[PDB]
């Protein structure tokens, strides 16, 4: 409630993010053709380092 008056309500905004995982052994110039292949706003993919 934007005020303090009511009858004691409590809403539960819950946000649930999922995650998956994939290994590679590959050289990392063609890591660039892993990235730029979907525009896709609904993904958050991350690039792990290729120093090994």
């Amino acid at each position: 409630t934007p005020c303090g008056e009511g009858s004691k309500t409590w809403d539960r905004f819950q946000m649930r993010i999922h995650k998956r995982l994939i290994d590679l052994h590959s050289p990392s110039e063609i890591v660039k053709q892993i990235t730029s292949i979907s525009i896709e706003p609904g993904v958050e993919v991350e690039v792990t380092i290729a120093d090994a």
């Binding site: 946000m15 993010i17 990235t35 525009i39 706003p41 958050e44």
Partner: protein, 57 residues
């Protein structure tokens, strides 16, 4: 700076989407704004308006 945790990545870009929504609603009120969609690239990033009158925007 150095990078930050994953649960605050997701409210960072959440609060990024909420703010330019509020600004462009005040900015493009008289042009039929109707929301924005974001695209994140690790390059020149990419946003669109959904304007009714593409003239005045």
């Amino acid at each position: 700076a150095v990078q930050i945790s994953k649960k605050r990545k997701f409210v960072a870009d959440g609060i990024f989407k909420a703010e330019l929504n509020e600004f462009l609603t005040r900015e493009l009120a008289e042009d039929g704004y109707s929301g924005v969609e974001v695209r994140v690239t690790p390059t020149r990033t990419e946003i669109i308006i959904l304007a009714t009158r593409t003239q005045n925007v």
